[PDB]
Amino acid sequence: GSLTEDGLSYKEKFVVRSYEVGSNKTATVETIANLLQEVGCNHAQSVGFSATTTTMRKLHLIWVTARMHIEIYKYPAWGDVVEIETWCQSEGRIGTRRDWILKDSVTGEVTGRATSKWVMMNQDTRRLQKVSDDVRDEYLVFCPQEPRLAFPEENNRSLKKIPKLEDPAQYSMIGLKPRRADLDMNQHVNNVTYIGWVLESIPQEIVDTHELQVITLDYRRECQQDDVVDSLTTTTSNDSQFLHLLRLSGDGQEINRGTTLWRKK
Amino acid sequence: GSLTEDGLSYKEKFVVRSYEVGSNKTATVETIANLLQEVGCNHAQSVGFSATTTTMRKLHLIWVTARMHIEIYKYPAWGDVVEIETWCQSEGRIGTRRDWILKDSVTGEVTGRATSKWVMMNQDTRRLQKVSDDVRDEYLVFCPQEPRLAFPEENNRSLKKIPKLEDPAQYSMIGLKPRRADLDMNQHVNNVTYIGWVLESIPQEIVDTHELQVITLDYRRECQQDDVVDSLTTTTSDSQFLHLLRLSGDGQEINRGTTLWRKK
Ligand SMILES: CN(CC(=O)N1CCCCC1)S(C)(=O)=O
Ligand SMILES: CN(CC(=O)N1CCCCC1)S(C)(=O)=O
Numbered sequence: 001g002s003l004t005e006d007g008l009s010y011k012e013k014f015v016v017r018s019y020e021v022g023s024n025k026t027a028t029v030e031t032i033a034n035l036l037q038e039v040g041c042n043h044a045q046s047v048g049f050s051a052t053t054t055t056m057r058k059l060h061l062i063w064v065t066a067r068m069h070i071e072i073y074k075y076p077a078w079g080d081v082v083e084i085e086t087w088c089q090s091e092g093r094i095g096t097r098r099d100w101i102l103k104d105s106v107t108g109e110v111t112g113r114a115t116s117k118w119v120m121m122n123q124d125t126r127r128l129q130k131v132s133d134d135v136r137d138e139y140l141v142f143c144p145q146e147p148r149l150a151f152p153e154e155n156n157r158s159l160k161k162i163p164k165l166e167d168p169a170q171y172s173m174i175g176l177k178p179r180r181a182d183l184d185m186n187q188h189v190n191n192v193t194y195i196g197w198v199l200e201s202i203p204q205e206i207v208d209t210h211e212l213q214v215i216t217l218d219y220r221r222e223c224q225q226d227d228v229v230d231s232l233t234t235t236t237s238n239d240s241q242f243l244h245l246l247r248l249s250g251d252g253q254e255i256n257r258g259t260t261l262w263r264k265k
Numbered sequence: 266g267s268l269t270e271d272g273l274s275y276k277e278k279f280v281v282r283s284y285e286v287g288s289n290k291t292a293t294v295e296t297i298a299n300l301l302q303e304v305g306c307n308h309a310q311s312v313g314f315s316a317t318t319t320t321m322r323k324l325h326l327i328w329v330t331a332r333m334h335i336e337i338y339k340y341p342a343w344g345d346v347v348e349i350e351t352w353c354q355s356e357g358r359i360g361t362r363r364d365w366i367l368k369d370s371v372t373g374e375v376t377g378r379a380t381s382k383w384v385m386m387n388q389d390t391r392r393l394q395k396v397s398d399d400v401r402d403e404y405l406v407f408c409p410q411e412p413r414l415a416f417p418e419e420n421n422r423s424l425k426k427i428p429k430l431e432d433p434a435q436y437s438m439i440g441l442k443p444r445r446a447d448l449d450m451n452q453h454v455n456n457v458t459y460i461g462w463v464l465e466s467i468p469q470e471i472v473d474t475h476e477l478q479v480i481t482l483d484y485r486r487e488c489q490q491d492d493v494v495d496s497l498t499t500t501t502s503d504s505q506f507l508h509l510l511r512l513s514g515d516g517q518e519i520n521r522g523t524t525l526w527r528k529k
């Protein structure tokens with residue numbers, strides 16, 4: 001993997017592994033999401049990060065994901081090489097965005113794209129805050145200044161507001177809990193585990209006859225390692241659409257909400 | 266990755282990923298086990314497998330793991346390159362063995378080793394059988410003929426018999442169940458998921474102060490996608506533990522095993 005010529009984006013190639021694919025012998029959306037995280041980490045390391053600045057470290061501030069949006073046109077097959085390009089962009093005091101483009105290494109065609117919205121949070125109190133001027137200046141040197149959007153479209157799917165699923169849910173998967181493999185190097189639940197939990201309540205008949213095209217996920221609250229989650233889904237719709245909610249098994253505190261769009265095979 | 270000069274073993278290099286490491290910023294044993302599976306698949310593909318032969322296909326026979334043994338001396342750090350070498354060997358009518366050696370790509374030092382025992386089974390009836398005459402003949406051309414053992418020591422850890430944990434267990438993790446990410450391309454629970462489930466009942470204080478050195482796991486019965494498992498652990502001692510995974514309801518054994526942990 002390497003930074004591009006101008007130093008404002010990063011590219012990495014991945015060979016899809018045997019355990020990374022589903023029933024169709026193509027990469028799952030969770031494998032894709034893990035590769036987006038990996039190419040994001042390699043980008044931060046390449047531009048000098050130990051992805052927080054010394055000022056953010058001094059203030060105990062971290063970056064946290066507020067929204068993830070992925071659209072896949074073709075999932076790479078087992079053994080295929082997929083090239084992924086990533087870059088960040090400031091969105092003023094609101095926060096920052098990291099975008100990705102996925103391409104088939106043989107054809108050069110775009111096979112997928114993704115975008116994420118990030119905000120600043122105090123790592124100890126968990127309180128949100130706007131991006132300060134001094135912190136913003138420190139990051140701007142690593143980002144393109146003219147807009148570079150993975151989803152440029154007028155009223156695209158990545159910016160649609162997601163409503164709260166009302167009980168009763170059409171489908172449910174209950175008592176889901178994280179194991180050590182679901183934790184990151186800081187003992188927090190990996191963002192990708194929440195995508196997997198959302199998808200646990202989709203009926204297997206949908207998974208067998210459809211392919212996942214779009215997934216948009218809002219992150220409201222972190223699932224702790226001793227938490228238990230319930231995954232809820234209700235059909236909202238040749239394409240099928242679903243509304244999703246992940247909430248704590250006991251009191252029903254919302255941890256995530258989202259939508260998926262599936263196209264018939 | 267590629268076959269070696271003689272065509273009897275396969276080597277592949279892997280760069281340890283950010284999500285592949287634990288709290289020590291080194292590869293988890295489940296990441297290691299997934300890389301052993303990956304280099305094993307790449308070996309079968311390189312020597313012409315579509316890892317069953319046309320004769321096995323005609324009989325609806327598959328290879329199934331009976332035992333996995335892994336010993337790690339140093340877990341590769343995030344960003345490190347680990348080289349893994351794998352080969353198979355016939356063990357007469359009993360079955361076959363796949364062995365692996367892990368090395369640090371910078372130093373060339375052996376950082377770990379693994380071995381697995383495999384038997385043939387009818388995929389539909391789930392009935393076991395010894396190597397069916399013409400089967401070992403079609404496989405022998407891909408294996409070294411002189412013994413090549415990852416664990417050569419006469420009667421070492423990889424061959425020790427594992428007893429059944431008696432109730433009550435010292436520690437337990439109950440109601441564990443597989444999600445889609447735990448399934449393979451054939452909708453079966455991935456072998457590596459059972460390693461993760463065995464380790465769920467080890468206390469977090471052990472994980473925080475010790476490193477896992479050895480894990481031996483016996484595979485008795487497959488967990489179906491709608492099954493729920495209980496993970497049981499009892500200290501037997503370095504720290505040593507005895508493990509049992511059984512179905513949450515009736516208590517049918519799915520796995521049993523042992524672990525050895527070294528103090529940091
Ligand atoms: C929101 N993602 C996290 C991410 O991109 N990263 C985490 C570490 C910083 C940059 C890379 S994801 C695909 O859900 O894992
Ligand atoms: C919000 N990002 C931080 C960021 O903008 N930067 C980090 C290094 C690349 C560009 C600058 S993230 C997704 O956490 O890496």
Ligand SMILES: CN(CC(=O)N1CCCCC1)S(C)(=O)=O
Nearest residue numbers: 298301302305306330381456457
């Ligand atoms: C027993 N293992 C399976 C394995 O090595 N393989 C499966 C596919 C054929 C060869 C590779 S493991 C590391 O526990 O997944």
Ligand SMILES: CN(CC(=O)N1CCCCC1)S(C)(=O)=O
Nearest residue numbers: 309316328353361363383404407
């Ligand atoms: C038991 N193995 C099959 C085998 O003997 N072989 C086929 C592939 C390489 C040559 C040898 S396994 C671990 O399932 O690949």
